[PDB]
Amino acid sequence: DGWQTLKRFLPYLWPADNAVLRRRVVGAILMVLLGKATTLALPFAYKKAVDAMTLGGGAQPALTVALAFVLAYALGRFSGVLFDNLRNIVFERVGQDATRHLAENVFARLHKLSLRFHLARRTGEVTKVIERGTKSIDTMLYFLLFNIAPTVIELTAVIVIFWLNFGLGLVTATILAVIAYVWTTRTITEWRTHLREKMNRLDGQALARAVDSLLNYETVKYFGAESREEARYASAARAYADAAVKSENSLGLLNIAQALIVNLLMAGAMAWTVYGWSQGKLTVGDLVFVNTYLTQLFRPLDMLGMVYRTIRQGLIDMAEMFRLIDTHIEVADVPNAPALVVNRPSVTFDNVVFGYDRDREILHGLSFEVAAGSRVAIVGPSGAGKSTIARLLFRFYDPWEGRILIDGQDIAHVTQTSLRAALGIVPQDSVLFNDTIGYNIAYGRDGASRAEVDAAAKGAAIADFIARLPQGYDTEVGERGLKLSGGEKQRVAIARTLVKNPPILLFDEATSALDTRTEQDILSTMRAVASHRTTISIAHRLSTIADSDTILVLDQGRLAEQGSHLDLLRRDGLYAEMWARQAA
């Protein structure tokens, strides 16, 4: 509930560092206290000012006493407002710092979590949650913190004052009033919360549908599907509006009940006071006093019945953000993991059995050894699952059984960072940042110099194409570089991995989008650049890999045939069939 959320948020407000920020909170609390004391004082001055005017005076009738007391009243009101604005000004920095640290922590945690949480994740939910939560925590914190506590202080103070100045039927009346108020408010809020949860869930679903439609604009255009999308959005919007109408009607009923109770209590107290006046026990200033005290007390509470809905939503949103921060990490490093030390880059697969889900096993005891410095190819027909090999090597997931070794070391027992530092990959579908081509190429290593980018662009055979562009390296690619052709994007990917210069390199359909001459050029660069590293090339078109040291042919998640190109042509098996057929 909300109480747990606030208890979780409380450590951020009173940090255990920054000795400077801690003092400001104390000062702000002191300002709050002075403001309350002044606003509490001013009605006693008003009551006495009224008392003086009627039934004689002490020096002069009203020339001096009435003027002095009216000016004291006005100056008091102004002083209270001044203190309130001063507390706001002093406090605002602590809040800004607290929310900045919350945002930074959530961002870091989201980058640390496992990919399986990224494979099915809607863009709209994450973006909406972070934007909404930052705005939410600022609004909720200010309204919550600075319009509830002083009212409690004033309620206790008023109880004390009634104690000191009257008989205690007033005390019993007010205590019963507060008890009724709390019980009624709680039961109504309980009824209201289920409908609130339903409304919020429907809103989130509608927004995610809308974003997916907008994100697939090309496909919606190709098939003329505009009307279908419009109807699909319209239905969700109507359902949401209905739920909202029910929610606000219940809010209105709760507000009417609360105002009835409050005004009943005021009626009763004023009546008892006038009855007491009839017997000559009390002056009429007592009447003015009680009236002013009650209205001053109840103004902050009546203010709230029109900011309720927002505060509620804010509290929900903050709970949501903590929920996101709490989800656990599926794949983590072991305790005290040693660093990876790569001296001779052999690769061993030892009886690896794996699948994404327990109901579909994909690899069936695949074992093989890739010798250091050798050039090997991995081929198979479609659906083979060869792209898992690579995804497993980077430890995006762990094997159910068996193990992977690099230089004789179990990759489950080493640090993730050294492992991924030792490996380079060129994937099938490469994504570009929304920035210049020069930034995208320099991204491979921290601080890439002009010489490294020039060398890589030469090795990638894109130098002339860039030279003929008007803006050169500053040509914008757009979103996912959708402004560049496929061969251009694949060349940028090759350049990136060239800039990394990793000891072990993986080509994952690296050449599939290029023309023949470009292909032969980059293939020659790849052969030259492979001098003393382990290179694994996964290719569809066999002619580009026929000179490999060894070829692994996978079918249906297992190793069907293994050996050199000549051995497989002699065996007359699957490889021979594939190659012969393709040649014709």
Added chain:
Amino acid sequence: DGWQTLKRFLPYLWPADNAVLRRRVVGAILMVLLGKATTLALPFAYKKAVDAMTLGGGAQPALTVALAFVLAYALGRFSGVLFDNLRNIVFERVGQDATRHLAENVFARLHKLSLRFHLARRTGEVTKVIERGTKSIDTMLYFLLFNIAPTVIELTAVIVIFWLNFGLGLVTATILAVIAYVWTTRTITEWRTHLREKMNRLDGQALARAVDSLLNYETVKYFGAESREEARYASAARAYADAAVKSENSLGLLNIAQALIVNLLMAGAMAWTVYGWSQGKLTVGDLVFVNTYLTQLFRPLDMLGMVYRTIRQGLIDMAEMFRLIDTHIEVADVPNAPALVVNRPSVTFDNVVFGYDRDREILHGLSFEVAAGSRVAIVGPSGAGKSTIARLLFRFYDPWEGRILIDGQDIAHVTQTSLRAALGIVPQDSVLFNDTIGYNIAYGRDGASRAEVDAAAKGAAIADFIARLPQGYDTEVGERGLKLSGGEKQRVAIARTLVKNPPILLFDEATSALDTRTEQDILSTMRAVASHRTTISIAHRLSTIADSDTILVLDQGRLAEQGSHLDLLRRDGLYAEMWARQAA
């Protein structure tokens, strides 16, 4: 400014076809008027109740007179709240309907706009603006509409009452108070707005950067670049927080000045009233009367100073939404465009000159004719720009000069819908909706039956693969189909286009991710399905298109060679070189 935004928004509030809602708005305004009248009346009753009890009495001036008037006071207070909540409950339906129609209009317009918009922007900004704006308009409409107009009514009424009951020094004093109030508020708000616009732009930029970081999770993982993104986000967040601190300081100063003016005016009025009382012109009830009137008047205005920031941001966002709605459409249908009639599907290109930007011309007077029913291929090396042809054919852009005709008809003069209805395309990068495989295949034509999907899945040679999946047609595939292999995605794309059954079909490197046997299979299906349509196949690997009726070879935006496969091999030109090289 805000005034223009509100004037634009007002037609949504007072509709013109339902008529049911129009009566409800009238009823709500009537309730507002009753509530204000009651809250205005009850202080006169209080002043008189005070006047009766002191210095005389009509009958029994101790219990009967005082009880009736205090009870009337309490009942009046309660009745005002009751009317206010009743107006809220009655009005709530109109707001929901208005915001629903606004959202629907923005969605439809966003779908109608030109592609060059989409390819220039970030997903996060548009999603943020639509979510933020709907929440913004609802909150702003409620606060704006129901906490400003009654204060104007009350101020005029109080002016009238002072007129009727006193001499007009009070009137001039209030007039001067209002004039000073408005002038001060305007000039301070003017200073504050420049800082506000900067704050908002900085926030938008930071959020866009964050979303692009999250959207490129794979690449950021591949290069261990987490620290760079964390620092990059952190700096923007600090800049934003600084700007926010300046803004709130200026708001605090404005609030203090306003409260000073208000409390000075009350001081003066009550002082003058006491001075007048000293001469016996006025009873003591007058003091309470004036005090209560002023406090009741100013209580709604003191509250606004703590909802100001929110309303301001809301108004900004509502302006933003209309700005988006107004942007003009680059490519529009001509007036009275006739429908397309496809009787003989020939395609003519007539001297088409085009480029994306006026500083880089890509096609240099390309002209050609594709005869109805022929099988033509378009080939070239990389960067050729052959991928522009299709985008031009669908009229995503217009030619600078020349024209394209189908059956002889200028495509610029026909309706966009009939034109795109006659064309099918299989693009290089195919996008999947976040849903099941069956939904994605059935999407090609509205209401697609089970027989058509079965026939298409057979023709695409994916039936066995789907049969071996546990959930079959109900298999989830992620978003952008990132869960499927490349061959699977390309097969789904082929199936969609087969489901459309268009008379003209374009294969844009359709066979690129498949193995040899799958390729030969689908190539046979295509050949069979091509019987009486025009088919244009753009292919990198020449062997797959050697049997075409004719092949067009493009280089650098021009036609290098044209003719049948044997003619080009005899010519010993570019085609011969490319083919020979690839074969070896």
